[PDB]
Scaffold this active site. Sequence first.
Site, PDB file in Angstrom:
ATOM      1  N   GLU A 110       4.887  -0.982  -6.463  1.00 46.54           N
ATOM      2  CA  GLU A 110       6.015  -1.064  -5.594  1.00 46.54           C
ATOM      3  C   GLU A 110       7.083  -2.181  -6.298  1.00 46.54           C
ATOM      4  O   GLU A 110       6.663  -2.986  -7.198  1.00 46.54           O
ATOM      5  CB  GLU A 110       5.368  -1.748  -4.137  1.00 46.54           C
ATOM      6  CG  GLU A 110       6.608  -2.809  -3.363  1.00 46.54           C
ATOM      7  CD  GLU A 110       6.302  -2.827  -2.039  1.00 46.54           C
ATOM      8  OE1 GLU A 110       5.510  -2.412  -1.383  1.00 46.54           O
ATOM      9  OE2 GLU A 110       6.737  -4.050  -1.575  1.00 46.54           O
ATOM     10  N   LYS A 155       9.570   3.546   2.219  1.00 44.72           N
ATOM     11  CA  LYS A 155       8.513   3.110   2.889  1.00 44.72           C
ATOM     12  C   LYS A 155       8.664   2.953   4.592  1.00 44.72           C
ATOM     13  O   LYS A 155       9.462   2.335   5.015  1.00 44.72           O
ATOM     14  CB  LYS A 155       8.225   1.521   2.466  1.00 44.72           C
ATOM     15  CG  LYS A 155       6.658   0.911   2.798  1.00 44.72           C
ATOM     16  CD  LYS A 155       6.644  -0.395   2.007  1.00 44.72           C
ATOM     17  CE  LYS A 155       5.231  -0.879   2.291  1.00 44.72           C
ATOM     18  NZ  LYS A 155       5.354  -2.255   1.796  1.00 44.72           N
ATOM     19  N   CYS A 171       2.362   0.867  -0.851  1.00 43.17           N
ATOM     20  CA  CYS A 171       1.874  -0.378  -0.398  1.00 43.17           C
ATOM     21  C   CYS A 171       0.812  -0.214   0.967  1.00 43.17           C
ATOM     22  O   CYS A 171       0.176   0.569   1.203  1.00 43.17           O
ATOM     23  CB  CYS A 171       2.920  -1.526  -0.653  1.00 43.17           C
ATOM     24  SG  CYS A 171       2.506  -3.057  -0.556  1.00 43.17           S
TER      25      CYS A 171
END
Lengths: 261, 261
Positions: free
Chosen positions: B41, B112, B145
């Site tokens: 990330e 995300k 993540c």
Amino acid sequence: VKVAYVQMNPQILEPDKNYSKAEKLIKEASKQGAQLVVLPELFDTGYNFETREEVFEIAQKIPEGETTTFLMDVARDTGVYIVAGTAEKDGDVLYNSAVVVGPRGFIGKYRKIHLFYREKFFFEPGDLGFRVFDLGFMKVGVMICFDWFFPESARTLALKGADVIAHPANLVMPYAPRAMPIRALENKVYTVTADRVGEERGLKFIGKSLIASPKAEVLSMASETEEEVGVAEIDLSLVRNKRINDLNDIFKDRREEYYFR
Amino acid sequence: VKVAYVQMNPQILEPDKNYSKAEKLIKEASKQGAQLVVLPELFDTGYNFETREEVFEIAQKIPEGETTTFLMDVARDTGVYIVAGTAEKDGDVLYNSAVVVGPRGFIGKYRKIHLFYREKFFFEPGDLGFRVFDLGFMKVGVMICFDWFFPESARTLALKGADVIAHPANLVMPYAPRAMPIRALENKVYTVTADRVGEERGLKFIGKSLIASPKAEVLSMASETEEEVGVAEIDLSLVRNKRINDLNDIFKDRREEYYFR
Ligand SMILES: [Mg+2]
Ligand SMILES: [Mg+2]
């Protein structure tokens, strides 16, 4: 609150022996202070059937039949709530079910939604959805055995307010003891997996019943082969506040419109 | 086919240095035979911001900006497909994104869905859902993540036919390395979590990048502190066959009518 598993070895097609055994172990859990006691999948009939006929012959109706009335007597005598797996006869069909009883009597039932392997030959897939039962001092969600494999089972119970997921199991794969702490963590709930032990017509069960915390800690875990009771104290404030830190509440953070499309 | 993570230590606000380091490590993975290489990330910008300004001023547009350009160049030169986390500038907005490139050019991006902790001060929540990119020889899902924490992220990718879930991460909690093999198992998919290492304004990342199999095996796992690559062969038939036995195909077995209700 204190919660417990009963890890026992059901004797196939011997419900009266299995009632005797369950009563003994439930009483032990009660003496330890447990308020909720979870038993394995199919604790009354056993599991490894050759034909649907030998289980249909002995399977009991819920709540009229012998397994439910037996557990009602035990819950009343010991003052605990019990979640226990049982072969449910409903007319001409069998479900792989769990009964929930407390000291006043029958509370409700759950029918296993995701059948495993040869269970598909014996049982009808469950049709009551994933239910959460409010006991006042706690809300208990119920799922059975292979339901663990689908993260949606635990998620559905947690979304419906479960403080603890009671999980009767008859494990044959070694994965669930590793996975249950993750199911507990991802929903911020406690889980109580009551597995059976034993070898039954050539099939060996895993044992390793466990209670997991919303921090993926194993609070109690059992042997692979012995009958035993495990008890843990649980903190309900921890599971009712879905914040994992001051900026993330796991249920408020879900964005359901992106899921499964 | 071989897949790989790159575990590196992004230097906050120094994309030039991060490109140099990434290139070195991508070449190492390629030298070991990797065809797919996953980076952490926010590999270009670092993570632990105090102001939205210090990140906004350097964040690159996708696909015309410098991070995508850089990644295209390395993908072409070393002959690999790359999935890498990058701060994405889109007008006056930033997304916490991942770019997918191959040796012939830009393939796509993911933003995300589930922002973690202080990311909420800097980034907009993603709005493209969970995408699976068809490379012809394999399909690659991407999540980033904290998306790991919600089982729905990996499930959505796996339902769309991901052979491998590429997972850029910057982990601060200890849980994901234990959970990833369960995400791989419950979806019968491979997962490649490329975590960063390092301390950044006092925040310590976990390292422990790992590749997990559809059998919950950990094929490769990195150190807590060092920069390194990890490469492992994957078996496409193991992920494409969703049967875990002759009677259970895990996707056929899902009963969405009982989920989340
Ligand atoms: Mg058999
Ligand atoms: Mg643009």
